[PDB]
Amino acid sequence: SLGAKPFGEKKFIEIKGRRMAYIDEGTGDPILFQHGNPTSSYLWRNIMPHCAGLGRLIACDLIGMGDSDKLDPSGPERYTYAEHRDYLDALWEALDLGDRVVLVVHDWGSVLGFDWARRHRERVQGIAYMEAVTMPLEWADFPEQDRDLFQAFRSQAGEELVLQDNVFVEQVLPGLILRPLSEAEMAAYREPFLAAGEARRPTLSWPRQIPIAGTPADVVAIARDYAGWLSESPIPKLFINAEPGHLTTGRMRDFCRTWPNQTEITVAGAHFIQEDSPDEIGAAIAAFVRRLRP
Ligand SMILES: [Ca+2]
Ligand SMILES: [Cl-]
Ligand SMILES: [Cl-]
């Protein structure tokens, strides 16, 4: 069902001298849910219950997000993809995930998860993905109506929009969810970002890192690498397509539809589809995991 309550209990662990927060419920092989910008483990709260008893259910809060520590001193050079990956790699190592992991990914969680899967392919049992960065983008691949805003994030205007005015949390987020969010739901999304200034830096560093028209080159190369790999990998896949969808449409979707050994369903949603169709998404993930784990 829908609902504003988080799933399970937040746990904390020290990583590179910082505390990171995560949900870790149940036993067995992990089903690892990764949020992106500007969300947290909270994104998965109505989806994870569908996988009850099917494995160890894990959702990590990226550094500087959710209940994870902020980086200090924060600034325009902090919270790059590379820095997030250092923290998340270390957290995932610390969690003792074993060698039959099912990844469930979204948004920046997909860049992180697809890249981790490429690097740890022997340990990946299945990959479920939705509204994901399936390959590097060209501007034509970025949803037309949001181009100007994201171009502004990727300019000097970004600090005012995001650090001062919290545009990613307050405008982009509800703008890409089809149903109205409750007061409690927005409170949960707002909480890590209540203070103006550097507390909000992760939500600006993220759009600045999106691999678009060759920039930034490091993230482009990472996405190029995992795009080639996923297009050939026999690892079972679940593609949760969205209508109307947002990012994973057009050529982005044409491309991921070429990936081997893949099941697809379509659910209602734009970008943050977990808030529109959580039960349809959860049901599909659970069915996928049941087939992977007979
Ligand atoms: Ca909306
Ligand atoms: Cl095992
Ligand atoms: Cl972003």
Side-chain angles (χ1 to χ4, degrees):
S1 60
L2 288 166
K5 260 67 150 58
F7 177 78
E9 163 209 26
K10 216 56 86 78
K11 295 169 172 60
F12 298 84
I13 191 172
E14 181 161 281
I15 298 296
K16 295 165 67 69
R18 307 283 187 188
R19 274 168 270 279
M20 296 184 78
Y22 64 103
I23 302 163
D24 178 6
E25 299 287 329
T27 57
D29 289 318
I31 307 172
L32 186 57
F33 298 80
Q34 196 52 65
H35 83 266
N37 195 34
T39 59
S40 71
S41 59
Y42 188 80
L43 181 69
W44 303 108
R45 73 201 176 279
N46 295 318
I47 293 169
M48 295 175 76
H50 286 81
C51 293
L54 300 188
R56 184 178 161 206
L57 315 180
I58 302 174
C60 297
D61 290 345
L62 299 176
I63 201 72
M65 309 183 79
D67 290 309
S68 287
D69 276 356
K70 303 293 175 178
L71 296 180
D72 287 314
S74 176
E77 291 170 355
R78 303 309 297 274
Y79 298 111
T80 58
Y81 174 88
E83 188 162 35
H84 272 283
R85 178 175 59 183
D86 287 342
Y87 282 85
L88 196 62
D89 272 12
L91 176 56
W92 285 6
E93 179 68 38
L95 290 178
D96 192 27
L97 302 170
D99 60 10
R100 292 285 82 193
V101 176
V102 170
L103 289 155
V104 181
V105 299
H106 181 240
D107 188 271
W108 276 107
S110 75
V111 185
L112 286 158
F114 288 157
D115 182 40
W116 190 92
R118 188 189 69 75
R119 292 179 292 122
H120 296 89
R121 65 190 65 185
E122 296 170 27
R123 312 175 54 190
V124 179
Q125 178 180 62
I127 300 167
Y129 68 97
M130 62 216 76
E131 279 294 303
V133 182
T134 56
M135 64 187 306
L137 285 74
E138 294 298 343
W139 278 113
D141 302 308
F142 198 86
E144 176 215 299
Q145 61 277 18
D146 300 306
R147 258 173 230 165
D148 286 349
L149 182 61
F150 279 74
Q151 287 159 0
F153 295 150
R154 299 160 73 93
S155 76
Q156 298 307 316
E159 274 79 10
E160 183 172 2
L161 287 164
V162 185
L163 310 185
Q164 298 180 42
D165 293 338
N166 215 13
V167 159
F168 219 110
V169 171
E170 305 282 10
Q171 176 185 339
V172 178
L173 174 59
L176 295 174
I177 294 166
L178 303 178
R179 63 124 183 145
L181 293 180
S182 73
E183 165 184 355
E185 292 171 322
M186 273 307 291
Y189 284 125
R190 189 176 295 119
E191 195 168 74
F193 303 122
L194 286 156
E198 292 299 328
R200 291 158 184 179
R201 178 71 66 178
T203 71
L204 176 57
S205 292
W206 273 140
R208 287 179 171 170
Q209 288 280 283
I210 307 163
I212 308 176
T215 294
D218 67 322
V219 187
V220 170
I222 285 156
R224 174 172 190 169
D225 224 331
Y226 72 58
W229 171 70
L230 283 158
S231 77
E232 291 186 337
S233 171
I235 294 169
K237 299 167 199 68
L238 174 65
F239 169 37
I240 303 172
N241 181 48
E243 176 66 39
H246 187 248
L247 173 59
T248 312
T249 59
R251 287 197 293 104
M252 301 294 288
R253 181 162 57 197
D254 295 337
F255 178 59
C256 71
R257 277 177 172 158
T258 67
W259 298 352
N261 201 10
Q262 180 164 277
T263 298
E264 177 184 328
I265 68 153
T266 295
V267 303
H271 186 59
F272 302 94
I273 67 170
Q274 300 82 358
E275 298 296 358
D276 286 308
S277 305
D279 295 321
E280 292 77 12
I281 291 159
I285 296 156
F288 179 59
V289 173
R290 284 191 292 261
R291 296 190 302 267
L292 294 176
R293 299 184 181 173

